[PDB]
Amino acid sequence: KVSKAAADLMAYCEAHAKEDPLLTPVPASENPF
Amino acid sequence: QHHGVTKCNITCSKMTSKIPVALLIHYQQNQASCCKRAIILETRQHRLFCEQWVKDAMQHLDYIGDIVVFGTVFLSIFYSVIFAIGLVGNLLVVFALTNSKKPKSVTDIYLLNLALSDLLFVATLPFWTHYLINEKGLHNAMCKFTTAFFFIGFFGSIFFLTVISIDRYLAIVLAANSMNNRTVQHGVTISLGVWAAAILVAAPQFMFTKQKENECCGDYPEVLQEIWPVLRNVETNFLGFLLPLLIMSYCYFRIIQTLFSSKNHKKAKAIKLILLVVIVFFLFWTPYNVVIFLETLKLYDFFPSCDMRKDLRLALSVTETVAFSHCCLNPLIYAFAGEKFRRYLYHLY
Amino acid sequence: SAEDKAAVERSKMIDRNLREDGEKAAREVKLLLLGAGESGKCTIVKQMKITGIVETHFTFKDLHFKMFDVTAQRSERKKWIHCFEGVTAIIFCVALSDYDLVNRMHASMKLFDSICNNKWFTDTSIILFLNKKDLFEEKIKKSPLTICYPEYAGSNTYEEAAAYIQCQFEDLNKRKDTKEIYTHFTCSTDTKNVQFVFDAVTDVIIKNNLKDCGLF
Amino acid sequence: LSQITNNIDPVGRIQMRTRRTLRGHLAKIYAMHWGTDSRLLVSASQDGKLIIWDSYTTNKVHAIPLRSSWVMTCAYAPSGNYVACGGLDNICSIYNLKTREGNVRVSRELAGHTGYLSCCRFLDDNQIVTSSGDTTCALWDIETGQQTTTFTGHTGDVMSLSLAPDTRLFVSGACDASAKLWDVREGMCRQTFTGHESDINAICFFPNGNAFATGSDDATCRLFDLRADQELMTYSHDNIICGITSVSFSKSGRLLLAGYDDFNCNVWDALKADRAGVLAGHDNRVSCLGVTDDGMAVATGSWDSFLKIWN
Numbered sequence A: 001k002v003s004k005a006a007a008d009l010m011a012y013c014e015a016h017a018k019e020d021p022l023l024t025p026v027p028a029s030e031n032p033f
Numbered sequence B: 001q002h003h004g005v006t007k008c009n010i011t012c013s014k015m016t017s018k019i020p021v022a023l024l025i026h027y028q029q030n031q032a033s034c035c036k037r038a039i040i041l042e043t044r045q046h047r048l049f050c051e052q053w054v055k056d057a058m059q060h061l062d063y064i065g066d067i068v069v070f071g072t073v074f075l076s077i078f079y080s081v082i083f084a085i086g087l088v089g090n091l092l093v094v095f096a097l098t099n100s101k102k103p104k105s106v107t108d109i110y111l112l113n114l115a116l117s118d119l120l121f122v123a124t125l126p127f128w129t130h131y132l133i134n135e136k137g138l139h140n141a142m143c144k145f146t147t148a149f150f151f152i153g154f155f156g157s158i159f160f161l162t163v164i165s166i167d168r169y170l171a172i173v174l175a176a177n178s179m180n181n182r183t184v185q186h187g188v189t190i191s192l193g194v195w196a197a198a199i200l201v202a203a204p205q206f207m208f209t210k211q212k213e214n215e216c217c218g219d220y221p222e223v224l225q226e227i228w229p230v231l232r233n234v235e236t237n238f239l240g241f242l243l244p245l246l247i248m249s250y251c252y253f254r255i256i257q258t259l260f261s262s263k264n265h266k267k268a269k270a271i272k273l274i275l276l277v278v279i280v281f282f283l284f285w286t287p288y289n290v291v292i293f294l295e296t297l298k299l300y301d302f303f304p305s306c307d308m309r310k311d312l313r314l315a316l317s318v319t320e321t322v323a324f325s326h327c328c329l330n331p332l333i334y335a336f337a338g339e340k341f342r343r344y345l346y347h348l349y
Numbered sequence C: 001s002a003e004d005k006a007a008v009e010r011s012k013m014i015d016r017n018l019r020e021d022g023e024k025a026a027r028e029v030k031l032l033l034l035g036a037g038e039s040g041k042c043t044i045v046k047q048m049k050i051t052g053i054v055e056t057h058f059t060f061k062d063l064h065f066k067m068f069d070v071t072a073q074r075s076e077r078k079k080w081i082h083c084f085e086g087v088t089a090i091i092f093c094v095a096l097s098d099y100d101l102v103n104r105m106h107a108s109m110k111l112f113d114s115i116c117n118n119k120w121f122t123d124t125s126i127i128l129f130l131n132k133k134d135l136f137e138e139k140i141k142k143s144p145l146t147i148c149y150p151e152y153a154g155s156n157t158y159e160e161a162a163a164y165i166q167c168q169f170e171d172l173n174k175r176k177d178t179k180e181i182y183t184h185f186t187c188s189t190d191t192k193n194v195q196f197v198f199d200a201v202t203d204v205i206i207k208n209n210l211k212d213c214g215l216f
Numbered sequence D: 001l002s003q004i005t006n007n008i009d010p011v012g013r014i015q016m017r018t019r020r021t022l023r024g025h026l027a028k029i030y031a032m033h034w035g036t037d038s039r040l041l042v043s044a045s046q047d048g049k050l051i052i053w054d055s056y057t058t059n060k061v062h063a064i065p066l067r068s069s070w071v072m073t074c075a076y077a078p079s080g081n082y083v084a085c086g087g088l089d090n091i092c093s094i095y096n097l098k099t100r101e102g103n104v105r106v107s108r109e110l111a112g113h114t115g116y117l118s119c120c121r122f123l124d125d126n127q128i129v130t131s132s133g134d135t136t137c138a139l140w141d142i143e144t145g146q147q148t149t150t151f152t153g154h155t156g157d158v159m160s161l162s163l164a165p166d167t168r169l170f171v172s173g174a175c176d177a178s179a180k181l182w183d184v185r186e187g188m189c190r191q192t193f194t195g196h197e198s199d200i201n202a203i204c205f206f207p208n209g210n211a212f213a214t215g216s217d218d219a220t221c222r223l224f225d226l227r228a229d230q231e232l233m234t235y236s237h238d239n240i241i242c243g244i245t246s247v248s249f250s251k252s253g254r255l256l257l258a259g260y261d262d263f264n265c266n267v268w269d270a271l272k273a274d275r276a277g278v279l280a281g282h283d284n285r286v287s288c289l290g291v292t293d294d295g296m297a298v299a300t301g302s303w304d305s306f307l308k309i310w311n
């Protein structure tokens, strides 16, 4: 279903959102910058 | 060196030897004012008139005019205004060239080097203005340092113009092998060599320049006392205006011939822009080159007349002012003729 | 930090090598070949030489050449033509006697118009070659040329027909300032053809060298 | 998708900046790839050589001369030992990376295609899938150097293709407004995707692997999934008409990159479908952009002969 696929995609996006350096600011020392 | 700016108020070449007489009242120190002339002798006739045998008698008993002062005061503000406009223009030009869409361009690198040499001229002028305004100097070395910067900037500017003309000559007429002869690294190396050549040629001009009380006088060891002035004058003339004219005359003639042969004269705006910049260069430097050559002939008694000497001194002062105006007018001509340069001005507007 | 220094020096050395190689490549003139299926005559008659494209190294008057034929590419022309920017000149080989064969001249006109209207080769000129001129005379004695060029309004003389064909190609050059088309009737002798190629390349180089100034 | 994603919080404006500048190329760059090491990337240009870029230290580690100067694409193997490049010579060249004696040498010169090679991808460490300009995509093997499987289902000039996270699924787009998925195991088309009106130049899979984003030449980005198959998500700006060259995804897929040819790149939201950032650091057309697997840094090459890394 289109709605089910969209919900699954949103769930996947939010699950790894915290693990995406681009999405949220990260310390300069932590990343190679 | 840089003969225009001086505290020259009395000059004496017509008459040096005088019979020892009681008319002597004092001896003015013309050496301090300008060591181009030696110690002058003053009589008792209530007027400024003018050796070993007279020196002893003077101890036992014991002209340029003020026109230069008024001109200098007006001359002072002249360098002030041309500094602002010329420095702003040169900085904008340097920034534009540095922020170039197409890098590794020989012409752009040479043009940037010419801008830097012009910036040296601009940077060295304020020191002379400060010297004139106050008659104070700076540690007895700022005068000499400023003279060295003046000669370095001028000689680099003339050299950079000539090589650009040679570069255009190659790239236009001898394109069959100019691409193989010159590349970005080769252009950088040639620019460094031109800088080194400017250092070498300008060294003797400023090699012996001991900052005087209020000017840049010269040590002139006994052997070179006469060679240093004449050597400086001939060098700045032959390698300053004469030979560059021939090299540019040879080059631009060949580019024009190639363009006419290829029917590219219609698309010859780029060569014309440099040609207008080149021709004005000679026009502004021609009065300086003729006068500096005439004073060279003065050593041979070419213009013994005192009034003629003052006229030549005035001519030399004004043409150096003309050259100062030209170095800030060069970016002005660039904006007037340049097309993408105008866009950069609007881009930063 | 010894390994860091070793990596830095190795990178600097290979970067210098890359810069030298790039300068050498820029020192070599590049050309592009195009046509309506008939091309490569100049390369064949050159008498000397050194796959989607064929690179034929060629040196004349101590100047290296690089011709990349693209007649073997059956994909969309515009998609692989934009990668050919920077080529000094474009060699256009077209058969003179293609008017009778069928529509070929119309296809050549369309290809030339597309090349001149691809907003990608504005600063690069196009070199025009008219092939099969030796066959053109006996092809034109019979054909009045009216079939391919309606309202030709001219005689059957070879001079007038060649002039009118060159006029056709001149009309296609919508931009007459940025690009200067050079046309030469290919002949049996390779010396004349190579001389014309050298002249066109020299003119292109001269034109390009007038746009490298920092004021433009 | 917009109605469903109406209640979510947009990421908002992001102050993307150039962490470092790479200026080792004197010619335009067409494609690049990000390695598994998250520190090495490959770029190609008309200089006639291929180099490997170390973004962490801003240095080049390898300099591989290319027989075919007109290279149009390049790829970096997941194992990091093989690097592949395309070109107009219809031959895909595989080069070793210090495999033996530390030097770099050509491992094989894959051949057999007629149309220009537009994109190549290292499916595994042994098999390489390449897309050519003759409407056919061929899966080659380095050991044998022959077409293990040939796909001729398309009817137009295929331009680019990408690899699924599982390394068992890939899709490609062509000039025709019809892109259909191909399965390595099945060997035949399974899903067909439509809805475009111009050529397709950018193809990349969503990291989840259940969808992919593409950018046509009409300034439109469309999302296609394996469930809806009706282009549930469509992205547009209604401000420019220029085409799209390269498109990629973030590590989580929330943030999307578009290689618009208007002298700058556009960063959009996969679900929000709204402007998020502008990368105007390029002075020429941009055709390269990719996100590292860990997402620490993002590279972007352009026709300006310079490559810049965004943190």
Ligand SMILES: CC(C)CCC[C@@H](C)[C@H]1CC[C@H]2[C@@H]3CC=C4C[C@@H](O)CC[C@]4(C)[C@H]3CC[C@]12C
Residues within 6 Å of the ligand: B158, B159, B162, B163, B186, B189, B190, B191, B193, B194, B197, B239, B240, B243, B244, B247
């Ligand atoms: C008009 C007059 C006064 C200007 C003098 C012209 C002289 C200084 C110029 C003309 C051509 C120049 C040379 C051209 C070629 C090179 C090779 C390069 O790798 C080092 C510098 C060197 C050797 C240049 C040094 C300076 C040079 C000799």
Ligand SMILES: CC(C)CCC[C@@H](C)[C@H]1CC[C@H]2[C@@H]3CC=C4C[C@@H](O)CC[C@]4(C)[C@H]3CC[C@]12C
Residues within 6 Å of the ligand: B246, B248, B249, B250, B252, B253, B256
């Ligand atoms: C060392 C000696 C032999 C060099 C002398 C070269 C002379 C002849 C060169 C130098 C500059 C040249 C001129 C520069 C500008 C033009 C304008 C053009 O529209 C017609 C030719 C004309 C008028 C050139 C004629 C020849 C010329 C005067």
